[PDB]
Amino acid sequence: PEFHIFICAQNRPAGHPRGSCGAKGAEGVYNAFAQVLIQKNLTNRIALTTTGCLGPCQAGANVLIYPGAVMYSWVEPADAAIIVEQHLLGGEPYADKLTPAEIW
Amino acid sequence: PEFHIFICAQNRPAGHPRGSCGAKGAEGVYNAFAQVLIQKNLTNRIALTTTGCLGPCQAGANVLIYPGAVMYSWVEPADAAIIVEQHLLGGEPYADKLTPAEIW
Numbered sequence: 001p002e003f004h005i006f007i008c009a010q011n012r013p014a015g016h017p018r019g020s021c022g023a024k025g026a027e028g029v030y031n032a033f034a035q036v037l038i039q040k041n042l043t044n045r046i047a048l049t050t051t052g053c054l055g056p057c058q059a060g061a062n063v064l065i066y067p068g069a070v071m072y073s074w075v076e077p078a079d080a081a082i083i084v085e086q087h088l089l090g091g092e093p094y095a096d097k098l099t100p101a102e103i104w
Numbered sequence: 105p106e107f108h109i110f111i112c113a114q115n116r117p118a119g120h121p122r123g124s125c126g127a128k129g130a131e132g133v134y135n136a137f138a139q140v141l142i143q144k145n146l147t148n149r150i151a152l153t154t155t156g157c158l159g160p161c162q163a164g165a166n167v168l169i170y171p172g173a174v175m176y177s178w179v180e181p182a183d184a185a186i187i188v189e190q191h192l193l194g195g196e197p198y199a200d201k202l203t204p205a206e207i208w
């Protein structure tokens with residue numbers, strides 16, 4: 001792996017006070033990433049893995065990338081290509097969805 | 105996080121042809137790490153997270169460490185402290201349980 005994409009997929013019961021990335025659209029986000037990776041022939045260069053809780057649940061859905069420990073928050077399906085294209089390939093973190101520096 | 109410890113926790117049904125790190129003692133491995141981390145006051149420095157399948161199921165229980173993409177295979181509870189101390193604190197990957205280079 002040149003890159004490792006970690007998608008928080010922790011579920012908690014509906015109405016849990018922490019919420020959960022699972023309830024915030026992790027499944028749609030994972031699929032957007034995988035669709036992008038398959039499309040661009042990247043599935044042998046970039047690993048895509050679900051995780052439990054990554055810590056900042058209220059900023060979900062959360063995505064962490066290694067190398068770098070770069071986290072993204074409030075992630076939506078449309079960002080998957082943006083992150084792959086501009087950060088992973090282009091070398092520039094997508095500042096619009098970077099987890100705030102105070103939180104991570 | 106200085107280090108991120110990823111513990112494959114994928115379960116598959118009993119008798120699944122792939123097996124699962126779940127069936128290979130992932131939970132015993134995760135608990136050993138957690139106990140070493142809490143005991144050495146490292147839970148703010150080193151993140152510990154469960155993951156879906158990391159790929160090489162036949163070599164499980166599998167742990168991956170970032171920075172570095174260093175995977176350990178056939179992991180047992182006793183290795184936790186070894187990896188934390190030798191590798192994560194001491195800088196020397198623990199040669200005895202490193203995932204064969206062919207595989208990862």
Ligand code: FES
Pocket residue numbers: 008009010019020021022052053054055056057058060062
């Ligand atoms: S549930 Fe996703 S970061 Fe906590």
Ligand code: FES
Pocket residue numbers: 112113114115123124125126156157158159160161164166
């Ligand atoms: S189930 Fe753990 S590596 Fe596949």
